[PDB]
Symmetry: C6
Subunit: 216 residues, 6 copies
Amino acid sequence: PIVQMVHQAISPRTLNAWVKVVEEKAFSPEVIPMFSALSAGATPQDLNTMLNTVGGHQAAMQMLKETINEEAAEWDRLHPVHAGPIAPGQMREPRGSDIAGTTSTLQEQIGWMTHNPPIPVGEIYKTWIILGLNKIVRMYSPTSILDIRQGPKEPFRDYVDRFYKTLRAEQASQEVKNWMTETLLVQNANPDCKTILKALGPGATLEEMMTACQGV
Amino acid sequence: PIVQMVHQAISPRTLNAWVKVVEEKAFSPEVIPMFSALSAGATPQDLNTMLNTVGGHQAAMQMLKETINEEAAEWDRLHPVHAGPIAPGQMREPRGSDIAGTTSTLQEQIGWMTHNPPIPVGEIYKTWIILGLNKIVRMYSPTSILDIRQGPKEPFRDYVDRFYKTLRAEQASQEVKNWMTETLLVQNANPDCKTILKALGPGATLEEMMTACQGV
Amino acid sequence: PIVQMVHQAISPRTLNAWVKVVEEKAFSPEVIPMFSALSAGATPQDLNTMLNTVGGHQAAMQMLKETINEEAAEWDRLHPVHAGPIAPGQMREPRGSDIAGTTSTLQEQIGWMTHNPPIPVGEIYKTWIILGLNKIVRMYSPTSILDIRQGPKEPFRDYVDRFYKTLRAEQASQEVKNWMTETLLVQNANPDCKTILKALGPGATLEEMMTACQGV
Amino acid sequence: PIVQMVHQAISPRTLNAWVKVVEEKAFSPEVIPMFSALSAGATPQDLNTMLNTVGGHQAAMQMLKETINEEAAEWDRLHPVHAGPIAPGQMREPRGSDIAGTTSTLQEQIGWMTHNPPIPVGEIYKTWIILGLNKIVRMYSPTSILDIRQGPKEPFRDYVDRFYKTLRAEQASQEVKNWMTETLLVQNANPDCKTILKALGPGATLEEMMTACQGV
Amino acid sequence: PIVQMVHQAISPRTLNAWVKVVEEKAFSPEVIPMFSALSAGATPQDLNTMLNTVGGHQAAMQMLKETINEEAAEWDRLHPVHAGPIAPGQMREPRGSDIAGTTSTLQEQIGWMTHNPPIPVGEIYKTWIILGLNKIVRMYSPTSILDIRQGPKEPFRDYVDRFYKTLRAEQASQEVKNWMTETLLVQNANPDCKTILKALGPGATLEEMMTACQGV
Amino acid sequence: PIVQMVHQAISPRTLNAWVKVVEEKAFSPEVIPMFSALSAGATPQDLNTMLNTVGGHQAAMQMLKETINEEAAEWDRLHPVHAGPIAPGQMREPRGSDIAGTTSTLQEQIGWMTHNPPIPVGEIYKTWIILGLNKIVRMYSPTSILDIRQGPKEPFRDYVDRFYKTLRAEQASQEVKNWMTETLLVQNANPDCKTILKALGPGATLEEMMTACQGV
Ligand SMILES: [Cl-]
Ligand SMILES: [Cl-]
Ligand SMILES: [Cl-]
Ligand SMILES: [Cl-]
Ligand SMILES: [Cl-]
Ligand SMILES: [Cl-]
Ligand SMILES: [Cl-]
Ligand SMILES: [Cl-]
Ligand SMILES: [Cl-]
Ligand SMILES: [Cl-]
Ligand SMILES: [Cl-]
Ligand SMILES: [Cl-]
Ligand SMILES: [Cl-]
Ligand SMILES: [Cl-]
Ligand SMILES: [Cl-]
Ligand SMILES: [Cl-]
Ligand SMILES: [Cl-]
Ligand SMILES: [Cl-]
Ligand SMILES: [Cl-]
Ligand SMILES: [Cl-]
Ligand SMILES: [Cl-]
Ligand SMILES: [Cl-]
Ligand SMILES: [Cl-]
Ligand SMILES: [Cl-]
Ligand SMILES: [Cl-]
Ligand SMILES: [Cl-]
Ligand SMILES: [Cl-]
Ligand SMILES: [Cl-]
Ligand SMILES: [Cl-]
Ligand SMILES: [Cl-]
Ligand SMILES: [Cl-]
Ligand SMILES: [Cl-]
Ligand SMILES: [Cl-]
Ligand SMILES: [Cl-]
Ligand SMILES: [Cl-]
Ligand SMILES: [Cl-]
Ligand SMILES: [Cl-]
Ligand SMILES: [Cl-]
Ligand SMILES: [Cl-]
Ligand SMILES: [Cl-]
Ligand SMILES: [Cl-]
Ligand SMILES: [Cl-]
């Protein structure tokens, strides 16, 4: 990675942390923030290290590769490289495969990241990776938000935990998520809780909803 | 985080420590001081990393989101942003969502935290998070302080441990807590201890109370 | 903490070390030196972090709070704060609650600790905490030094281990401890060892006493 | 290793990480990226340390030695050393065995790596090692890509995981790998999935293929 | 400790390492080199931290205290402190209890250790501690070197391991140790090995002795 | 150790790593590269720390002592110390026991290692230690290379693993090792493999030999 500047290897602990996270949690949604934290200041070389150290899950890892290549091709369309000899005190313009670290060297990556103005190839590549990880989380989610229904003796808190877990795995925008919360949460609550939540009105906070259905 | 200045990634150990704390202790009151210690010098990006790495407990995490948004909206009311182009050698004034790290970049966060005078967005956001965590601790507390009663063969020390554990989870002010201690502790002690503690008078320290009921 | 100067967060390992020490050893006497080592260079904020991260033992932790408040009130009596506006290039004089970190900020704590001359608020607060921890160790000690008696088939080394373990938990001064050693150790040894130790005379070292009763 | 410059020992954690990786994963393909990450900035001395700390697998380790010697001999052919006394402020030209660290000293390795222009002997030797590791991965792969066939009740995702795991161990070029994907994946799918994938046409992404055969 | 200069706290890992060593190995001879390594650059405060963090073994720890006090009293005899006010840019001369860290402050310890010329109070105190630890190792050794005799079917290597383990715990000088090796090792070997070793003559190395009795 | 310069203590992790390596692997050949890596930049004091922290194996550790003394005596013969007072800005010439760290101080060791020109006493002593460790590995090897014979149903890969494991423990030169490989490997293979390997001719690589006998 790079930190406030200087380059260094990914630490053994960071490497092991990532490998173990994937071994333990597969593609539960919280893996993505963990990936992002473990890859802080990463060069594309470091990001490829992290992805290539995953054994198994090779369908997911292939899907990620295809997503990356799609984003790289889009970058190339928007940023076509201009022909000419690179001047003294200048860097060549990166293509998509340079950002993804397959056709660039570490020095070139360092060159772009530490240039003035900077070309943050590590952060660009990370956005592409996270887009691909989000697709995998979606695909690997066992359940739909439409099927989350409170059981007749289920504590409301447990139902809400299942609701918001499933909502998190959905790849719908924030406005759609708001509609899901406003509509389904109360609609798919059990008869007694549902009646109590409708009495609160559509202005209630989750805290107030949870407090209301505690006794039920 | 930032430390005496320079920015760096949250360490794998810090990340793992937080994840494991939540896995093991859920929302026992001591989790909050642990959160605060693990988030020392944190930018809002780092604070979101910590909260987003939690898998499960998504009712609690949603309640926390709602608390954050409430505090952000209050900030916006008290600190309305003034229209105009930002001068050379100046930072734009942060709105609530900039403090909570959803509409600001890391450089902007670094910019505010290291400015002269500083705008400590990390510490402001942390106060909002801790307010939300305190609400969750309250809500998830199984017991009321009014129901803590010493058993007829219960060592006074064990009763006092249960009393002060339950008191800690109550979200009443320090003056109310003082009344609880002065009134209930002795009132809800078992017959023999209760008689002995009333004989000490209302000036006794906890040490003296504990020593008095040792033999009982 | 602060180290030779610069401030930084308490490390996750330090935090975990302290939590685990308390989980494992409760209030055995060796916990106090461990506390002191783990809190080296600590600000009052860091010291409160350490104490607040303890879950359970809330009778002990309340006793500690009361001890701290007693020491803070004594500080206030000896060091009454003088009214007036604080000059440029000067620090306000700390009251007891500033030393204990409940009414002071981290910058103010840093301000006092790094001032010339220094006001070591962290070390002052640590002495108060250790006074309180010593009271808890005393109170939680199961045994009195007067009751430590060598069994008729007990190796002298095992008896001496029990003697000095119990002596360590007593909160009597060094002169009283010397009397206990000079008087009780030999007095409460078993018949055969006791006779052998009285023959050595009152000038014998512990090494010589232990060697003498090896064969017994 | 060397990091942005300064030399230092390989850390105990790096050493242990490598030893344990080999103990646990043998020569699964992901071991190679792990080797590369753990050997970041390595001198040839450090690389030999890593390889020599492996106990067991001595057939593989001998094959690696032979691969290294082959690459060293090729280097010598392409870069024959010129006779003459080495000038003040100059380094002798490295032969293959100097790059592999058997006839050079640590200072000489440091000398080449930190020279202007640099002669990155660590990175050259690492390419040779990885060539040898790739040969071992190939040789130790239990299965051929031609034999990966979806079972009649096998989830398509599981079949794809096995396909891309086996493909990764093949030491065929990227163009051959593309042919394998375009031809075999669909060809060796089970009757019902195979029919569904042929209906998608040869433009489908893996995501689309996986989604199509979810219900099957 | 102090390292090339700057002071810092003993690390949690160092603390834990020492505690665990004592828990696991008690007073086997190798504990002393481990103590010495873990206490590298230690101030007397750090050395007391290490000794005071030991729970149990309080007979041994008391014997150590008595040994320390004996060495402190000897220091005082050889180095009597001269009366007078300490000059600007000068340090007071340490007494035995200042070296052992009970009557000196950390700053004073730092003062002596970093003075020109240095007064290495940490290293002086460490020699006293190691003298005391050696006495404990001796006292706690279960066996005498005179009783180590090779069994009639015991591999010579196992006998030699027991011999040199027991020899290490003896607190006799190097010349006495040489006599023990030259005399007893061969004398207390089993009949067949003993005959073979006497045939080698008194010039044989241990390697040659071990090789000679391999087949036996 | 010393690192690019500055001196510091051996880390607790390094110490523990070495102790555990010896506990787990005894004197398997890979222990020596591990020793060398863990002792990088070591002073003789640090090297003695590492050797003295070993509990048990005291026959081996005595053999190592004798090997060290032999090398020290050889050093003394080749480098006799010249009588005279040591000049300002000069170091006394080290004798063998100064190199082995028994008659020199840490400052003197630092003095030699950081002098211009340097006298690398740590690296010299390390060569002596490794010579002694190699003697122990030889002596403790259970098997001879002449006795490694492929079983009639043994996979060739398993036979080759045993061959090269045993070869590694032999203390014969590289030319002798080459003869062993060229002669014995094929000679001591099982009837069917042996016939197949003789058909390849004496130019075959190990990879080619292993591939040839895969089906057998
Ligand atoms: Cl995995
Ligand atoms: Cl998953
Ligand atoms: Cl890679
Ligand atoms: Cl790869
Ligand atoms: Cl850009
Ligand atoms: Cl970047
Ligand atoms: Cl569900
Ligand atoms: Cl969780
Ligand atoms: Cl909870
Ligand atoms: Cl995040
Ligand atoms: Cl998230
Ligand atoms: Cl502000
Ligand atoms: Cl802040
Ligand atoms: Cl309770
Ligand atoms: Cl606890
Ligand atoms: Cl206790
Ligand atoms: Cl706190
Ligand atoms: Cl708290
Ligand atoms: Cl003061
Ligand atoms: Cl302080
Ligand atoms: Cl007892
Ligand atoms: Cl292995
Ligand atoms: Cl393998
Ligand atoms: Cl090596
Ligand atoms: Cl080797
Ligand atoms: Cl080159
Ligand atoms: Cl290199
Ligand atoms: Cl398969
Ligand atoms: Cl212990
Ligand atoms: Cl012992
Ligand atoms: Cl202490
Ligand atoms: Cl103590
Ligand atoms: Cl001195
Ligand atoms: Cl010192
Ligand atoms: Cl024995
Ligand atoms: Cl051992
Ligand atoms: Cl062995
Ligand atoms: Cl030592
Ligand atoms: Cl030793
Ligand atoms: Cl030399
Ligand atoms: Cl050296
Ligand atoms: Cl074998």
